[PDB]
Amino acid sequence: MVEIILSHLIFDQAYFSKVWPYMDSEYFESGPAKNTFKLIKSHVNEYHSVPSINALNVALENSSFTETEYSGVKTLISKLADSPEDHSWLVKETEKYVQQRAMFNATSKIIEIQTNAEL
Amino acid sequence: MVEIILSHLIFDQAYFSKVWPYMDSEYFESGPAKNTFKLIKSHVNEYHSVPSINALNVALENSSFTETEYSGVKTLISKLADSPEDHSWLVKETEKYVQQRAMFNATSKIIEIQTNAELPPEKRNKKMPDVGAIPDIMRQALSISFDSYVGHDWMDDYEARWLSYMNKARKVPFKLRILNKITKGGAETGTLNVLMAGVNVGKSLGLCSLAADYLQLGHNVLYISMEMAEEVCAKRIDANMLDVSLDDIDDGHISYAEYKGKMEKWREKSTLGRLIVKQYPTGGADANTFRSLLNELKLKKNFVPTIIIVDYLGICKSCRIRVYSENSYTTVKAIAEELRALAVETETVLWTAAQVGKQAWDSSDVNMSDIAESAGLPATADFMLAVIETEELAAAEQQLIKQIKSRYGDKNKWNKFLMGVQKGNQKWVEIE
Amino acid sequence: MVEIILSHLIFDQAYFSKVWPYMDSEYFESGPAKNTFKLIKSHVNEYHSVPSINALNVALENSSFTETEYSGVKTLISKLADSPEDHSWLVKETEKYVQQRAMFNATSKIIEIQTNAELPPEKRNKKMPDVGAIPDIMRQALSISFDSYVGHDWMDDYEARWLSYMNKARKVPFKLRILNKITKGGAETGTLNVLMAGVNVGKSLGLCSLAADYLQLGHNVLYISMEMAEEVCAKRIDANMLDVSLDDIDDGHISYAEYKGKMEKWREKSTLGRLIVKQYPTGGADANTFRSLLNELKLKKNFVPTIIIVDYLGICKSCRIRVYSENSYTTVKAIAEELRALAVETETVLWTAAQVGKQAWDSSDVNMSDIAESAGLPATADFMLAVIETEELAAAEQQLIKQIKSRYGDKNKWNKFLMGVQKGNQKWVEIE
Amino acid sequence: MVEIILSHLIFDQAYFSKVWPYMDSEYFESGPAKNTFKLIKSHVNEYHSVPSINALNVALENSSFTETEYSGVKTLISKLADSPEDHSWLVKETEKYVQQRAMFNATSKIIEIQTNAELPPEKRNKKMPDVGAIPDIMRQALSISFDSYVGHDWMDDYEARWLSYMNKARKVPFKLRILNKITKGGAETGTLNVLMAGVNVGKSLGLCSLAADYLQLGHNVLYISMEMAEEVCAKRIDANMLDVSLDDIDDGHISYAEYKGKMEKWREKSTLGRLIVKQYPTGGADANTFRSLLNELKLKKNFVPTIIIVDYLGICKSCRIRVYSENSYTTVKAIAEELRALAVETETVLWTAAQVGKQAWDSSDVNMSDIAESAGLPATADFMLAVIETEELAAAEQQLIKQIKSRYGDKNKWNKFLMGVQKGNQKWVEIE
Amino acid sequence: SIPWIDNEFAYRALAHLPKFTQVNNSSTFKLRFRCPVCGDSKTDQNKARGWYYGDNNEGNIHCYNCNYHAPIGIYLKEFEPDLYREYIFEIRKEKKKIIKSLPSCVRLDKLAEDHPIIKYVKARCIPKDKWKYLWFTTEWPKLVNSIAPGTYKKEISEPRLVIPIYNANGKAESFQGRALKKDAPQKYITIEAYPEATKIYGVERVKDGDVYVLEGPIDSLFIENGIAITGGQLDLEVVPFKDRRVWVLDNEPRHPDTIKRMTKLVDAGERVMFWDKSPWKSKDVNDMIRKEGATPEQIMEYMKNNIAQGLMAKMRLSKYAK
DNA sequence: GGCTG
DNA sequence: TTTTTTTTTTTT
Numbered sequence A: 001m002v003e004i005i006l007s008h009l010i011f012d013q014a015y016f017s018k019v020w021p022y023m024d025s026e027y028f029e030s031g032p033a034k035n036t037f038k039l040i041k042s043h044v045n046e047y048h049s050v051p052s053i054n055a056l057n058v059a060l061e062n063s064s065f066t067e068t069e070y071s072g073v074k075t076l077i078s079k080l081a082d083s084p085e086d087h088s089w090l091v092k093e094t095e096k097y098v099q100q101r102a103m104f105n106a107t108s109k110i111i112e113i114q115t116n117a118e119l
Numbered sequence B, C, D: 001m002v003e004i005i006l007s008h009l010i011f012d013q014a015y016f017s018k019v020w021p022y023m024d025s026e027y028f029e030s031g032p033a034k035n036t037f038k039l040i041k042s043h044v045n046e047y048h049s050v051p052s053i054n055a056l057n058v059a060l061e062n063s064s065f066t067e068t069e070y071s072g073v074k075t076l077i078s079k080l081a082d083s084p085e086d087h088s089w090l091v092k093e094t095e096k097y098v099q100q101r102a103m104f105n106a107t108s109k110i111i112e113i114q115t116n117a118e119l120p121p122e123k124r125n126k127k128m129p130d131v132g133a134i135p136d137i138m139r140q141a142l143s144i145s146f147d148s149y150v151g152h153d154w155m156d157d158y159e160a161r162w163l164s165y166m167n168k169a170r171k172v173p174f175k176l177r178i179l180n181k182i183t184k185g186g187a188e189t190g191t192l193n194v195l196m197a198g199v200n201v202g203k204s205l206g207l208c209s210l211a212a213d214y215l216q217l218g219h220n221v222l223y224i225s226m227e228m229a230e231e232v233c234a235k236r237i238d239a240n241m242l243d244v245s246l247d248d249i250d251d252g253h254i255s256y257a258e259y260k261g262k263m264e265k266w267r268e269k270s271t272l273g274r275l276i277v278k279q280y281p282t283g284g285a286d287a288n289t290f291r292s293l294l295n296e297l298k299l300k301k302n303f304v305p306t307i308i309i310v311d312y313l314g315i316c317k318s319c320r321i322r323v324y325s326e327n328s329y330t331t332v333k334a335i336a337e338e339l340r341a342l343a344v345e346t347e348t349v350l351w352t353a354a355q356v357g358k359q360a361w362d363s364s365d366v367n368m369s370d371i372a373e374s375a376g377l378p379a380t381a382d383f384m385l386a387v388i389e390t391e392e393l394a395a396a397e398q399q400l401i402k403q404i405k406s407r408y409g410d411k412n413k414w415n416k417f418l419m420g421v422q423k424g425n426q427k428w429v430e431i432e
Numbered sequence E: 001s002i003p004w005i006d007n008e009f010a011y012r013a014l015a016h017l018p019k020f021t022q023v024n025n026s027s028t029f030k031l032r033f034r035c036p037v038c039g040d041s042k043t044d045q046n047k048a049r050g051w052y053y054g055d056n057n058e059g060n061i062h063c064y065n066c067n068y069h070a071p072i073g074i075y076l077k078e079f080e081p082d083l084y085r086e087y088i089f090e091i092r093k094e095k096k097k098i099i100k101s102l103p104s105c106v107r108l109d110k111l112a113e114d115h116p117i118i119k120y121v122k123a124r125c126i127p128k129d130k131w132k133y134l135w136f137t138t139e140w141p142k143l144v145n146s147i148a149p150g151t152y153k154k155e156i157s158e159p160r161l162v163i164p165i166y167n168a169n170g171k172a173e174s175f176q177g178r179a180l181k182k183d184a185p186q187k188y189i190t191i192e193a194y195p196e197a198t199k200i201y202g203v204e205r206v207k208d209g210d211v212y213v214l215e216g217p218i219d220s221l222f223i224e225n226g227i228a229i230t231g232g233q234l235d236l237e238v239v240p241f242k243d244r245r246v247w248v249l250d251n252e253p254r255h256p257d258t259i260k261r262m263t264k265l266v267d268a269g270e271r272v273m274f275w276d277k278s279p280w281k282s283k284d285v286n287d288m289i290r291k292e293g294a295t296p297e298q299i300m301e302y303m304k305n306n307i308a309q310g311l312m313a314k315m316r317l318s319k320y321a322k
Numbered sequence F: 001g002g003c004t005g
Numbered sequence G: 001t002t003t004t005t006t007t008t009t010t011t012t
């Protein structure tokens, strides 16, 4: 549910205040999701506020992205919307997603470690 | 190497007595290998002995398998021979194989646990553990080393320990009563002993004196020189043994007749051993060179040295670290560890010298902190004595020896004792 | 015959004992042979035993090289088989093969060095040795003959040792009586002697006096100045030999007639060698540079020195450590060790100067701990003499020489004596 | 006109001697011309003479070049030919070509600079100048004419020196006559002036008083404070210039009406400069930071200071040093050298502060050996002053200044002059 | 970086270089040229080992002869300074054909059994029913020039196995030639009718269930729902059935390029196939059948059992890598 | 007939 | 991040 996480990071404030300090770039797939989160994180680090859609489209144009990456990020930004839901299911779902991503990254890392050891 | 493991399970009792304790059907495979191991396990369970090829084939006929598995098991069973490989390599390789297969199984298990966790609670299986069991699962698969020995018990093995108290074969006497008194019976085999002092104080003098004393006791002594030539050190050994002088040798005061007579008289003695002096260029030798030198010495002559004297550890060169890869605290300690490993492998008393920093070159006393090279050398060392000489001492020809690191005995019972060093004869003389 | 060598390394314990110590990875090939030998060497280093075919196959399966290399190694291992042979034909053939491969590698490296040095700088692929050590590498290609010298036996080899005491060709006498007395016959060839004085106390006046004294005793002297011009050192030697003060030469109190007469009178004397002065920029000469100088002196000038003198070792460059990489201790110790190696190689008495620390300047006594740039220099030097000058000594035209490291004799005896240095004539005179 | 330039470099001595010292490889092209000029420059460096055609196409062209480069260089060398042209037109055309190429290179460099700075960090190609130093590059490119200006000839440049003398175009006079009679007209432009007072003795009252005097003298003053905020330093300046006690501005005895009236009375005066106070964290500003601050002030506020006052030299950091050093001698000396280099580059009188040693605390006299942080700081300073008001001068509102190092005059002429401190108003007044 | 201005500027710089060819697929921009630094191969005058790759973040030139590797900006700065000026300035400025017939091609199922190509395809052990998906020709350059003229200058008669590729509609848009002779310019010559043609063999034969994607079109003939990408862009996107495709490559555990493609596929979260428990040892499934006596339905049994995805695919790849 | 890092 | 030589400096 990366699209929902990004949408409620941009368009919601309590969700942003609750989940932002724990989000990391490694929790997103290497496609449009990670680049969009990179743009959001850079904007937050530079201005200490949640960017809007216009801010990110400005940040996307002022970015060193390939054509495929640019198209993917633009499509993902276009797809974002504020779907009204409850701020008790979103937080737990985001926590579950982050835990799953952390477990996946740990599994990949230990597989790489075992492959490296046998060399 | 499943074929080797199965062949040496069936055809080797020593291998079966060290690996069968730690062996499971999950470790081998999912095909013919697992079925063959299952047949072996079933036969050993029903009858407490290692099965033979004929018995294994009869059991395979009795047991039921599908056509493919039957053919695979028959083909695998056909491929079993004695093949007497080395035991150490075999056990190490089977330990590695077991560890890697266990790690693979643990990784697959945790991947299955993670996949099952993402399933809805209705669909998920209750037999698979929760994600919280991921770490310990990966830890029990890292503790499958092959080691059945648990160690001493202090109450179930006090008889064996008392018998070990009576095994004094490790001790080697010193030919000097004070050194035997302070070492509780002399130095021990496989130990790194160091004789440290300042520059031009008598470190090589002490090494040659120890070499001569061990030679007169019947030991085989291997002197490895790193600065001096072979003939120069042999001159010091001659001055110690023949007991005339160093200058008189070079001043012609010794008539060939006397030299030949003394050498032949020492040859007639049956209590004399063998001494070989080997020189190496500075920074060009270590245990790797020393092991090849040992092998060549043993092959060429019936010479297995009991005492190995290294002229200086510092002048020596580390095996793994390059000539100037790292600083002194590392490579010096690495050379010390390699020398101690060589000594414990050859079961020989290893003697070497050490340099002292400039802070104690003119001091009446020297401490362990006054080691010019790494302080790891006074960690791998066992009996690090120290030689201190002053003007008053040199007037009486009496170097002071301070007990710096005493692992054999009490370091402070006789901390400082005077020796009777004769520099002309390159000999240490006890004082009574 | 690589297949035979590997096969008899596997299936012959006697063959492995002699050939192994010498076998190296650079003697077989760049393909299957080198990979198979690397497998065997790794197994030997890990288990200290010759691997079997099963062990080689297991190590091959646990290897990371590509499909071509894997297939080549598998074919080579499958082709290995013991054959009825005789130890001698195999050892001699292996020696021939190893020598040929060593020569081939040496000439390939020589061509690589030549084609690398013929490149513009800053693009010459550094860490490659210069052309200067082209012949030495070839000298390493010829010193491989399966005949490693085990060492010197004290009792077995003592006639050869005794035919080294009255030979006395190792010792080169001084001209001053006190220096001969303290060294018991003078300095020895293949040594490193050092003068420690400070700044502007002596230490090059002493070197020039030694050069003049050796020159008068029919010696070929090679003065090497790293901090002074060839004409300043020659002027010092002229002042010493001709008994004319340096002030007289500067003030023109000596005529051309007297100079010519003295030079011709010295020339007509049979007891006089040849002195050659060579100047290098500070920090621009090393042991390899000195060896190149020796070679070009032998060829062009038919000059074979025995009393090679270097003005200051601290001013020279290490031939192994990159400049300003290691501290003063390591660099100076390496430089001194390389100079001693050169001296033992060419069998010459090597004389050098060394600075003392700032704390030793203007002091009535100089200790061994006052050495300036390294504590290893006293450890790697055969003889050291400390030159001490105070105001009272300067007013008396005398200097106190203290024996700091006396490897040719006992330093406690005659530790401090007063030389009569005459600074105008750059000469040392005795007081006896 | 590359071909003409090269042809008359090869085939004209006068043109060569005129234009060669101003030639650079970055002027011709990225093809055959650059390679030909590289060959010519290498030949001139190696042999100090103009190469011929044979030297170019044989001794030099046989080098590490590709086929296309080799063909281009061969064609260009074959195309070179001497042509009769006047040696006033050739020099002028060459100068115009060099100026055009310098402008082209500068434009390309600033384009790159802008392109690099547009990129986000972590890919910003460090060591490349920032966008602020674009105009200086263009100005340097503009002044690339062929005029010989290497140093200051004593006899050839006495007119400009006398103009400097009569104009006194180095002195910046003080507002205190006592500091002008010992400096012979005040401090000089490219100088580093230091105050040493101790702990809570002054050392910022003096700097603030000097800043206030320079402000009243119409100078632009930049106060870089490392130990105090901008507001507190500006409050001290307000106390100095408004004749109001520093406590009165805190308790509230001064109304806003009179404060604004005094500020506007100061504003209407044409003899008033601009004072800008900038604060940096203690230990987080170097000479590069000060240069960036100067560039920012010049670009944004159009502020080019003539006086730079660093509140404390010892709590800055060194731009050259990359790893912090526990040795205060080297760090403080490097900081002082960098500050003086900045002062001489910007032609700004640089005042700073230094801490005295604890021994000098409550000492009626402070010598130069009482400097605390480093002994190299007094060596780099052009003028030092010491404040030694111990106990009795405090009761009389006095401070004694010693003049420890004076490069503007003899420090033994007026060593002590007993300055009239006023701590409430934070100022210095004379005792005339 | 700015990729399209690098593509535009690089082209002009490499246009001067001889043997200049525009290798431009649907998603990449490459330029083939003779290397100007070394002159490329001295022995072979027709080799163009200099390449420009502009599909990355930065367009880079790489020479496979003299090992020159540089950005396009460094190349322009060092060799074309007049072009280098405008290049760095312009930075600030911006900041279908269907194969309807196959002439001289005969399908293999209507050919006589004593034809020498029938003996070869019987030696390749292809099942008979697939023989209506394969043609044979002796005028392969004439056929290619009939489809795409100008690629072959002289139409020398070459016997080759025709491999038409149909889309999901079943319309032939490309065709591959398998070299019958051991000496050939290329083992597999793929010829397209229009540049956006599909390079996946046999998409029209996909039934329900998992779709097995192989590397050889002949290898896919033993496989139910077996299609095969003919190299080209190897784009997973241009490959349909993304939810249910099976990624099968040749059995090569020590080959670095094969494991590189495995790592690229498993990092994308795809369903990759693993030969780590295979009883056979040949490189491809056709070689397994021909040399190791394997029948196809055993192979349909093995792969389905070892289909892998994600993390348990990664650990397998870890053990299959060496 | 392509292939880099 | 420690370790060891040498030096230079400074603080107590």
Ligand SMILES: Nc1ncnc2c1ncn2[C@@H]1O[C@H](COP(=O)(O)OP(=O)(O)OP(O)(O)=S)[C@@H](O)[C@H]1O
Pocket (backbone or CB within 6 Å): B379, B406, B407, B408, B409, B410, B411, B412
């Ligand atoms: N056999 C012995 N008899 C009497 N005292 C002994 C004997 N062995 C050791 N000691 C004393 O025990 C002291 C401590 O020795 P240890 O227990 O080995 O200390 P340590 O720190 O372990 O030494 P290491 O491991 O070599 S650093 C020594 O300093 C000796 O004085």
Ligand SMILES: Nc1ncnc2c1ncn2[C@@H]1O[C@H](COP(=O)(O)OP(=O)(O)OP(O)(O)=S)[C@@H](O)[C@H]1O
Pocket (backbone or CB within 6 Å): C197, C198, C199, C200, C201, C202, C203, C204, C205, C206, C227, C246, C247, C423, C424
């Ligand atoms: N040209 C000269 N005339 C007279 N006396 C001289 C002359 N040159 C040197 N001396 C004296 O010789 C003494 C020692 O000279 P040197 O041998 O050069 O000293 P030094 O130790 O070699 O100098 P460094 O610091 O090691 S390079 C000086 O102190 C002078 O008294």
Ligand SMILES: Nc1ncnc2c1ncn2[C@@H]1O[C@H](COP(=O)(O)OP(=O)(O)OP(O)(O)=S)[C@@H](O)[C@H]1O
Pocket (backbone or CB within 6 Å): B197, B198, B199, B200, B201, B202, B203, B204, B205, B227, B228, B246, B247, B311, B423, B424, C379, C406, C407, C408, C409, C410, C411, C412
């Ligand atoms: N030829 C000799 N004749 C008499 N005494 C000697 C002779 N050579 C050395 N000595 C004495 O031996 C003492 C120290 O001997 P060394 O073995 O040289 O000491 P060491 O330097 O620690 O050992 P090294 O450096 O490995 S040779 C000196 O102080 C001399 O008094």
Ligand SMILES: Nc1ncnc2c1ncn2[C@@H]1O[C@H](COP(=O)(O)OP(=O)(O)OP(O)(O)=S)[C@@H](O)[C@H]1O
Pocket (backbone or CB within 6 Å): D197, D198, D199, D200, D201, D202, D203, D204, D205, D206, D227, D246, D247, D423, D424
């Ligand atoms: N607000 C104030 N009111 C009155 N006197 C003050 C005030 N602040 C500082 N002073 C006086 O000014 C002197 C302090 O010197 P400063 O100019 O502040 O620099 P400094 O304190 O010597 O520098 P350091 O490094 O902080 S000791 C002392 O004589 C104080 O009594």
Ligand SMILES: [Mg+2]
Pocket (backbone or CB within 6 Å): B198, B199, B200, B201, C378, C379
């Ligand atoms: Mg010694």
Ligand SMILES: [Mg+2]
Pocket (backbone or CB within 6 Å): C203, C204, C227
């Ligand atoms: Mg000198």
Ligand SMILES: [Mg+2]
Pocket (backbone or CB within 6 Å): D202, D203, D204, D227
């Ligand atoms: Mg202050």
